[PDB]
């Protein structure tokens, strides 16, 4: 786990996942049905779905009918009224363990390949806004139909006012992307965000264009928490088969490394994290 990188970067936080077990002061399981009224999976902290094998985090998706721990808890009717899901999988979140604000975030991962799988590396902004105004940085999203295509994608409202999703995203095709591990990299100042695979640029954003109207002030100059997950289905994503053909399937994260220059820790201290204003 290098401490340096040329550019006077320096390791600040991460996980090579070499432990006896997932480190609870670094990751927490998401539990139950969380998102996407078209999804087919419920999320569990059970090693079945979540564990360290061969020095990766393993998020492992099983065709398996399983009760939704949110079956009558949470304020979304379709979650609140869905007793069971076919399909269990894993999701870890730093929501409660680590927030990131400026730096370079390196995530190395091999992705599953079967009908309906939706592996994702992504971050949500913690600030006075709710989705999508808070912000969302999708380093990776992949879907079954188009399995060699990497989507990286920013989500945010057009001004501070409208809560419509004025998203900006790019794509690269990597041929047989499921064969090898690829490094997903986000560089982030208070002036831009770069989202790469494998040193190929998927999407840049200039943050001098994501200012929100009046005061409000920029969702991308607040801290963001990290999510590693495999969903199943989606309103757009091939749905996984009624009978679970192709499953089980694994999403392997070799490592998560966060780095910061003197510069990136400097810029952080100089913005109201609740708003992104100077
Ligand atoms: Ca590792």
Residue numbers in the entry: 10 to 287
Lines quoted from the article behind this entry:
Two of the A. muciniphila enzymes (Amuc_0724 and Amuc_0875) cluster in a different branch and are relatively close to GH16 family members that have been characterised as having endo β-1,3-galactanase activity. However, Amuc_0724 displayed significant endo-like activity against laminarin and weak activity against barley β-glucan and lichenan. In contrast, BACCAC_03717 and Amuc_0724 both possess a finger 2 (in addition to 1, 3, 5 and 6) and this has a more variable topology than the other fingers. The structure of Amuc_0724 in this area is much more open and is a likely explanation for this enzymes additional activity against laminarin. Furthermore, the open space at the O4 in Amuc_0724 is a potential pocket for sulfation that the Bacteroides spp. enzymes would not be able to accommodate. These finding suggest that the side activity seen in Amuc_0724 for some substrates with glucose in the −1 subsite is likely a relic of its evolutionary origin. The structures for BACCAC_03717 and Amuc_0724 are more accommodating of milk oligosaccharides and have more open +1 subsites. The human mucin samples were incubated with Amuc_0724, due to its broad activity, in combination with the sialidase BT0455GH33 and the products were labelled with procainamide, and analysed using LC-FLD-ESI-MS.
Here we describe the discovery and characterisation of endo-acting glycoside hydrolases expressed by mucin-degrading members of the HGM that are able to cleave the O-glycan chains of a range of different animal and human mucins. These O-glycanases display endo-β1,4-galactosidase activity and specifically target the polyLacNAc structures that comprise the main backbone of many mucin glycan chains. Overall these data reveal that the nine GH16 enzymes analysed are endo acting β1,4-galactosidases that display a preference for polyLacNAc structures found in mucins and other similar glycans such as KS.
